[PDB]
């Protein structure tokens, strides 16, 4: 099993990461055949090239991350809360989701599922 | 497809059944072929008789249970953040999960799981 010290430190990366545009830092927590399903009822994308190409289109525009609560891990699964928020246009919107990671047993992501909707996005 | 205001309306319905301690609204909440996995990673119980006893278990002890921030949710399934306190003998725990739950065809939850583990639970 994955401790949960691990898999908290790597929800913590994957934030600071995506804070910092550090694409290839993302890309190195997932597994090799990860998926990645976002938001949740969406068709799953799999394995490095795919996700690599999910998070580039992802940081098209700056987006501020920020953690919301503690993380939850415990047997090989994380669950997080955070919201990201950016401005197109002249406009800001803060999207706050609860994304669910599972890791194998090298301690990679193996499965990323983002769950939020409509009403989960909100003004800046 | 569920709608997200019946999901989250049934969240809701779930958290105020457990504050007043009332096993049948609980329960209805739930397919009669649901699972409930809590803490994730611990055997599920499936079907009424086991999710029933289930929530007997959980409700020998006086419970304050709260949402903490807004319910997410999309497709079929809602996750939600949310604290639960209970007391025994004047020792009071409190505990910080995230829930999943997803949804069948006739809005009834199919599958709960509970993921939080011991760095998310404060004794005393």
Chains 1, 2 share one sequence.
Not at 100 to 122: D, P, Q, T, W, Y
Request: negative net charge.
């Amino acid at each position: 099993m994955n401790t949960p010290e691990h898999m908290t430190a790597v929800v913590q990366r994957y934030v600071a990461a995506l804070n910092a545009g550090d694409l290839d830092g993302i890309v190195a927590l997932f597994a090799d055949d990860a998926t990645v399903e976002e938001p949740v009822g969406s068709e799953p994308r799999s394995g490095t090239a795919a996700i690599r190409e999910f998070y580039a289109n992802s940081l098209k525009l700056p987006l501020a991350v920020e953690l919301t609560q503690e993380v939850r891990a415990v047997a090989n699964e994380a669950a997080f809360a955070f919201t990201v928020s950016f401005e197109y246009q002249g406009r800001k919107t803060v999207v706050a989701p609860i994304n669910h990671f599972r890791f194998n047993g090298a301690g990679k992501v193996v499965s990323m599922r983002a769950l939020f909707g409509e009403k989960n996005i909100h003004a800046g």
